[PDB]
Write a protein that binds this ligand. Structure first.
Ligand SMILES: CCCCCCCCCCCCCC(=O)SCCNC(=O)CCNC(=O)[C@@H](O)C(C)(C)COP(=O)(O)O
Ligand code: SF4
Ligand code: SF4
Ligand code: FES
Ligand SMILES: [K+]
Ligand SMILES: [Zn+2]
Lengths: 126, 90, 95, 86, 114, 688, 208, 48
């Protein structure tokens, strides 16, 4: 046979070594990151990311540096699809929420529409 | 040779400029050359008409052409700075 | 151009000084608060404005490749000088 | 001690909410004319099962499932809520 | 859903392995208290073993408990062969760690963590 | 279908006629380089960066402007496309200043990035560059015009979206300068968005200037609360400190813009903040205390209250979690007197049906209307991106706009019918000439402003507007899926407070003034201590000390919208959630955490511990408040209109004047904007 | 493209393609993919039931003789349901060549240990146990090799944080080095560096 | 520097100091930035 049938939910939380505080009190956010509106390039909007809720950052009394106590504060994960991210968060016991991908809707462009005979879409200058 | 404006006491939006009434009749004759809904097409002659009455264009002739043609004043400033005949200095 | 707080503490060129009720002055007890007493904002004001005969001037900070990247400053405003964004030197068209 | 508000959750398109929809199109108005100072919050949503929430005095809330009712059954459940006030 | 097993074909073999690992830890606790010259009792060390076994007591997957038994055997080999120092044994007893706020109100008082 | 087949690098793609070369390349997942093309602006075609080879054609075409012909093979990676890109990038970088270290665009510069990706690696320009005089277009947008590459996104934005027509190009040739030609101050309600679309650092944010740098910032995706648009934003922080606020693209709300209050009111979020709990000492002065002492002194007064002894006013910036928290807390005392600052009329249907207080059409449905009627509102400042959507429909769909109110500037031309409310009785009778326009329009849209509902005849105005909407919809050519009746809200907390069943307006507290008053962020000054009895116990819970906090007895320092994960519902009923960007300063806490801890001190512990359990309660009160980015349609306009016919309230003779007539009144509305030094500079700049 | 561009080696590309076809057709039971990179490196991507038969082939076959195990490697790729990618770099001193043998596993499926083929693997896959949590069946002494003795967690998994979950300090009360939850006096500053523009159009993936 | 002198500047130290560690003149670190959040100062008049 050499194959067993495990009909249970996949759960590796006892094997990851993550302490309980950072399994059951964390909210994973699964999202495609928004395009930086300083720029027109879209190559950062191609993958799904997983991040966590930001915890407390405070001021170091000596230097004024940003002291943290959150180990997961920099943990950003990359996924090809939404279902891979959902499956990875369910496998690790993370409570998650998913934002759907926002695509830009197809616009209707026409250079001649800048010079219409009777429509408001004339450009006053060019 | 500057393409910005600074308000001097001889060139400001309170510099006295207005058309003579015969220049208003000429402006009406100019505006009737273009179709209705395209009154902005009379920016280039009328502004030059303001150069013929005055000799040069302060920023009161540009604003007057913008007022009587119902066009934004920036769109007259663009035409006045684009074209080399419009004297923006006396 | 250093001044002093009423606590007796030197205000830095940023403007940082601890409050009187701030406990973090205790780190300077028996020791010193190291400030630099050559304020760059007070030293770049001491430079003379360069009167040049051109409309666009170039600044590299001096020294050629030992300065900053070479930028071009327009001098069309006669109200205000044209200041280099790197070294802080300022220029005026002489007409 | 007494009823304070009523909350009626339902769907716009689900057939299990249909009688609840049949309640609000016909019998809500003379309900609201009968109870002008009673807030009856109608809340439509996308895929919910129908539900009647009855908040009473001092934070007590009873909870009636209006799923697959007719409009007569919604009328009877709501008038039982109005007549109970417990 | 047909997966390759690690050691156990089902959960009963898995519970057998959990049970033998618990027997080996239970026998090992007095020797661990003695040769690491700990400050705990043998009963307190066996309580910590029972606590660590009950911590994983909700797992229903045979492969996950096979890996838990494998990792427990590894920790046991690191304890018997004296590879751990005293500090690694005493890390199960979070003693210098101050007790965390457990209820809502004290977590409200100390900060922002839920 | 009429789809034509074209080819991008040999790959077939079916495109609509009129689709450009750039959009056809976008449909196969390839982004053509660009500087002047912007998909929300008009096509310019004047940077020439998008030049691409069509094969069997010996000339590159501008992909942003050229429509695809059937059978074209667009060669996005061929040799002469790359040579065109390198030549154009060389001419862009010829006169561009070496300012990348001192420029705020560095790291997030289009010119840098696609010079790295598409231009060469070195220079041939052996000449002296040009230098341009800088401009002063206002206190928001710093202007360094030597960095300008003359892509004219300035001018197209100010003309077509902002509707200003005061930017342009003067001069000719290489001396062509983008500017205003005069000392003019570009202060629109959307004036900071040119910082977004400027691909270079010619237009930067003056408050953000020099402080940070894009690679080190953390990007927290969050929601605007400055109005009831619910604009999706990115709060960019850096080491536990909010740096700036960018927009997120949401196609149905804020397309990719935000307003200037949204963009620049974040500096009020680090001034005048409530950081520690305060109680009154023996001298009657506020003094700092612990959370134990403050919550004990509030709960000891709350246990002595019952019924109408305790009431609560919700402010304009309160999330749905704290709203349902304080509602359940006062319902444990059996208090139903929970109010907002903003009056919505309870006459008739009230807040029972959702359809009579929502923007029922949508923000997106403005694109589908053909006649929009605006009553008693100045939507340019009450909801600036709702007005931007009306302007986009005005410009592209030839939308007919009418306004009943004072003749404000809306950045487009409308039909001003008058300011008296009796015109609402004339359109609802058919004697007015605009009534025939509403009859013959297929998709009419009647938007009542919620600021006009602050008048004492708000029920009469809402009845007249609902009578107009149901006179149209039940008779004229409306399908039935189309929504006509609409209310534009200006307050982020208001729609969530109405879904939870608050009593809008403070008339319930003016009826019987209580001996204990909660103020969740209430800073409108709607209820002062002259309205209360002799020793009312006022508890201010909020994040700024502006209005309600100097009169309070115990101050509960709360979280702001960047400091909590928090549900806000916009004017169309869409529920949205902020995320934690930074933590609240000092001893300040999340708002429902404060109310829940107060409930535990009082011995009336509310049945939730975590944020998810609060949202389960919030789903129990109305399940739309947890279905995020969803607009649940609200039916039953007919039943609300039948209930509105019961009590005939009389229209006042006062004309419909919105409270914000000029740009002066826009910049300071809530406690964050009033604490903002940038908004203070905006007001001082527009008042001079 | 002479001075600054790497010269392409077409002869090695053709030879490694021929040998990749050779191995793919001798062993079709386990070989899933065969690829040769542009810089001429052959990868045999196999099924994990053929770890021993493929590696025994390449070690012992007279046309392969990959007698040396250069390196044994895992890669965490969390978007795959078989997230761990086990990499066998092999060296044939007879034919002066290198091959790469790649397979996969998830957290729970054991990979067969290759100590019977290459004894060099005895520590390498032992490290793959310590760093990734991949169990290796029939390993002689499988245990941790790099982490501390009480270390929970498999660090080179990409969901493991950079600083860990614990940090040590000496405590003079208990006279002992203790482990506490990690608090950084300065947080590691995450830099989002990736450009929003496409860098390599030859690697463009087809969109959804 | 007797043959090739160093270039003189107005900010170069005329007095070179040696290693001051372990003395009262040693370096003590501090945050050179100012306060980030401003607190609300309540009014000093009573509220009646
Ligand atoms: C001195 C300090 C030393 C500390 C020792 C640390 C040892 C750590 C080893 C951890 C190994 C495990 O916990 S594996 C256990 C997981 N087992 C399961 O999930 C299956 C369920 N098992 C059980 O319920 C077990 O109680 C039994 C005994 C197998 C069956 O009980 P149920 O019947 O009622
Ligand atoms: S606009 Fe871009 S390329 Fe120009 S100086 Fe700024 S960062 Fe550099
Ligand atoms: S300032 Fe910026 S947006 Fe305006 S034309 Fe110049 S490069 Fe374009
Ligand atoms: S992007 Fe097409 S030319 Fe500017
Ligand atoms: K910019
Ligand atoms: Zn310089």
């Amino acid at each position: 046979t050499q194959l067993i049938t495990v009909d249970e939910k996949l759960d590796i939380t006892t094997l990851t070594g993550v302490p309980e505080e950072h399994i059951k009190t964390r909210k994973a956010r699964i999202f495609v990151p928004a395009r930086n509106n300083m720029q027109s390039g879209v190559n950062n909007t191609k993958k799904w990311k997983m991040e966590f809720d930001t915890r407390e950052r405070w001021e170091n009394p000596l230097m004024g540096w940003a002291s943290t106590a959150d180990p997961l504060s920099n943990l950003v994960l990359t996924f090809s699809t939404k279902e891979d991210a959902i499956a990875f968060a369910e496998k690790n016991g993370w409570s998650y929420d998913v934002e759907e991908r926002k695509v830009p809707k197809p616009k209707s462009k026409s250079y001649g529409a800048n010079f219409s005979w009777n429509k408001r879409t004339r450009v006053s200058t060019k | 040779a500057l393409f910005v404006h600074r308000d001097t006491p001889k060139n400001n939006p309170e510099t006295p400029f207005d058309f003579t009434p015969e220049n208003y009749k000429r402006i009406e004759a100019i505006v009737k050359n273009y179709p209705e809904g395209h009154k902005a097409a009379a920016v280039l002659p009328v502004l030059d008409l303001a150069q013929r009455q005055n000799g040069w264009l302060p920023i009161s002739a540009m604003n007057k052409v913008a007022e009587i043609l119902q066009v934004p004043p920036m769109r007259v400033y663009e035409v006045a700075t684009f074209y080399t005949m419009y004297n923006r200095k006396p | 151009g250093v001044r002093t707080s009423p606590t007796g503490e030197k205000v830095t060129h940023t403007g940082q000084v601890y409050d009187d009720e701030d406990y973090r002055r205790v780190r300077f007890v028996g020791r010193q608060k190291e400030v630099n007493e050559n304020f760059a904002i007070d030293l770049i004001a001491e430079q003379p404005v360069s009167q040049v005969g051109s409309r666009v001037i170039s600044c590299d900070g001096g020294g050629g490749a030992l300065g900053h990247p070479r930028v071009y400053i327009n001098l069309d405003k006669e109200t205000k000088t044209g200041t280099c964004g790197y070294c802080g030197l300022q220029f005026r068209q002489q007409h | 001690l007494g009823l304070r508000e009523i909350r009626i959750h339902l769907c716009q398109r689900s057939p299990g909410s249909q009688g609840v929809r049949d309640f609000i199109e016909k019998r809500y108005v003379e309900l609201k004319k009968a109870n002008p100072d009673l807030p009856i919050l109608i809340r439509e949503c996308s895929d919910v099962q129908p539900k009647l929430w009855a908040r009473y005095a001092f934070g007590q809330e009873k909870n009636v499932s209006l799923n697959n009712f007719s409009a007569d059954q919604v009328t009877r459940a709501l008038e039982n809520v109005l007549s109970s006030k417990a | 859903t047909s997966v390759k097993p690690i050691f156990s074909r089902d959960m009963n073999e898995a519970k057998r392995r959990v049970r033998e690992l618990y027997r080996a830890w239970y026998r090992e606790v007095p020797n661990t208290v003695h040769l690491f010259q700990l400050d705990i009792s043998v009963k307190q060390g066996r309580d910590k073993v029972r606590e660590m076994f009950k911590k994983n007591a909700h797992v229903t997957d045979p492969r996950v408990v096979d890996l838990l038994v494998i990792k427990g055997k590894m920790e046991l080999e690191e304890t018997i062969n004296v590879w751990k120092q005293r500090t690694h044994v005493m890390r199960f007893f979070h003693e210098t760690e101050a007790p965390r706020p457990k209820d809502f109100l004290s977590k409200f008082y100390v900060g922002h963590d839920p | 279908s009429n789809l034509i087949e074209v080819f991008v690098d040999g790959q077939s793609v079916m495109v609509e006629p009129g689709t450009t070369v750039l959009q056809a390349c976008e449909k196969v997942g390839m982004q053509i380089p660009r500087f002047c093309y912007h998909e929300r602006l008009s096509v310019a075609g004047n940077c020439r960066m998008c030049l691409v080879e069509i094969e069997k054609a010996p000339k590159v075409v501008a992909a942003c402007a050229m429509p695809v012909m059937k059978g074209w093979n667009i060669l996005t990676n061929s040799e002469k496309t790359k040579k065109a890109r390198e030549g154009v990038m060389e001419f862009l970088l010829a006169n561009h200043p070496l300012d990348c270290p001192i420029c705020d665009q560095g790291g997030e510069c289009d010119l840098q990035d696609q010079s790295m990706m598409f231009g060469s690696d070195r220079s041939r320009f052996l000449e002296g560059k040009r230098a341009v005089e800088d401009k002063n277009i206002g206190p928001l947008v710093k202007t360094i015009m030597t960095r300008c590459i003359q892509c004219t996104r300035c001018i197209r934005f100010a003309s077509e979206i902002a509707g200003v027509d005061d930017l342009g190009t003067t001069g000719r040739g290489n001396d062509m300068q983008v500017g205003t030609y005069i000392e003019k101050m570009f202060m629109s309600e959307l004036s900071g968005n040119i910082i977004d679309i400027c691909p270079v650092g010619a237009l930067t944010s003056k408050p953000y200037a020099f402080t940070a740098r894009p690679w080190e910032t953390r990007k927290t995706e969050s929601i605007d609360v400055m109005d009831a648009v619910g604009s999706n934003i990115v709060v960019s922080t850096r080491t536990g400190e909010v740096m700036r606020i960018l927009p997120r693209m949401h196609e149905d709300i804020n397309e990719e813009w935000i307003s200037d209050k949204t963009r620049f009111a974040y500096d009020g979020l680090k001034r005048q903040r409530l950081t520690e709990p305060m109680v009154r000492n023996e001298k009657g002065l506020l003094t700092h205390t612990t959370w134990e002492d403050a919550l004990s002194r509030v709960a000891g007064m709350l246990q002595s209250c019952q019924g109408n002894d305790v009431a609560a006013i919700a402010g304009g910036l309160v999330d749905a979690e704290a709203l349902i928290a304080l509602k359940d807390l006062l319902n444990r005392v059996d208090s139903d007197t929970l109010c907002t600052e903003e009056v919505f009329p309870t006459a008739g249907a009230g807040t029972d049906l959702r359809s009579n207080y929502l923007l029922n059409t949508t923000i997106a449905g403005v694109e589908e209307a053909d006649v929009v009627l605006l009553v008693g509102t100045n939507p340019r400042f009450e909801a600036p991106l709702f007005n931007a959507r009306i302007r986009k429909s005005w410009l592209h769909n030839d939308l007919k706009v009418a306004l009943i109110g004072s003749p404000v500037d809306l950045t487009y031309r409308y039909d001003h019918l008058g300011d008296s409310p009796k015109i609402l009785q004339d359109i609802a009778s058919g004697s007015h000439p605009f009534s025939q326009v509403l009859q013959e329009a297929k998709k009419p849209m009647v938007v009542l402003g919620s600021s006009a509902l602050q008048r004492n005849d708000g029920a009469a105005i809402l009845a007249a507007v609902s009578n107009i909407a149901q006179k149209i919809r039940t008779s004229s050519g409306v399908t039935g899926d189309w929504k006509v009746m609409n209310i534009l809200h200006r307050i982020a907390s208001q729609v969530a407070a109405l879904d939870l069943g608050y009593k809008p307006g403070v008339e319930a507290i003016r009826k019987n003034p209580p001996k204990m008053l909660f103020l969740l962020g209430a800073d409108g000054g709607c209820v002062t201590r002259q309205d209360l009895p002799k020793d009312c116990f006022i508890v201010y819970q909020g994040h700024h000390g502006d209005v309600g906090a100097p009169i309070a007895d115990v101050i509960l320092p709360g979280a702001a919208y960047t400091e909590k994960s928090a549900t806000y519902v916009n004017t169309e009923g869409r529920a949205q959630q902020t995320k934690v960007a930074v933590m609240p300063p000092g001893l300040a806490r999340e708002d429902w955490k404060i109310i829940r801890a107060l409930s535990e001190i009082a011995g009336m512990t509310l049945p939730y511990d975590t944020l998810d359990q609060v949202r389960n309660r919030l789903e129990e009160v109305s399940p739309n408040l947890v279905r995020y980015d969803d607009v649940e349609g609200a039916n039953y306009f007919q039943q609300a209109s039948e209930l509105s016919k019961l009590v005939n309230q009389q229209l006042l003779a006062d004309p419909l004047v919105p409270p914000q007539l000029t740009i002066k009144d826009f910049y300071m509305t809530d406690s964050i904007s009033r604490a903002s030094q940038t908004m203070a500079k905006c007001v001082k700049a527009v008042t001079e | 493209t002479r001075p600054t561009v790497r010269p392409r080696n077409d002869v090695a590309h053709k030879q490694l393609s021929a040998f990749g076809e050779y191995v793919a057709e001798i062993l079709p039971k386990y070989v899933q993919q065969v690829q040769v990179s542009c810089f001429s490196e052959l990868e045999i991507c196999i099924h994990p039931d053929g770890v021993i038969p493929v590696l025994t082939f390449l070690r012992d076959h007279s046309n392969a003789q990959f007698k040396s195990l250069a390196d044994l490697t895992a890669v965490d790729i969390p978007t795959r349901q078989n997230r761990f990618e086990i990499v066998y770099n092999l060296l044939s001193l007879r034919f002066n060549s290198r091959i790469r043998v790649k397979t996969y596993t998830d957290e729970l499926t054991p990979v067969e240990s290759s100590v019977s083929v290459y004894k060099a693997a005895n520590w390498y896959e032992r490290e793959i146990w310590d760093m990734f949590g991949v169990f290796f069946a029939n390993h002689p002494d499988l245990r941790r090799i790099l982490t501390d003795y009480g270390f929970e967690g498999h660090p080179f998994r990409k969901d493991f944080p950079l600083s860990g979950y614990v940090e040590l300090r000496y405590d003079d009360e208990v006279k002992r080095v203790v482990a506490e939850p990690v608090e950084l006096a300065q947080e590691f500053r995450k830099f989002d560096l990736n450009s929003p523009w496409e860098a390599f159009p030859a690697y463009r993936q087809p969109p959804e | 520097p007797t043959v090739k002198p160093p270039t003189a500047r107005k900010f170069i130290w005329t007095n070179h100091k040696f290693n001051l560690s372990g003395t009262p003149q040693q370096y003590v670190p501090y945050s050179t930035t100012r306060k980030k959040i401003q607190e609300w100062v309540p009014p000093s008049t009573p509220y009646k």
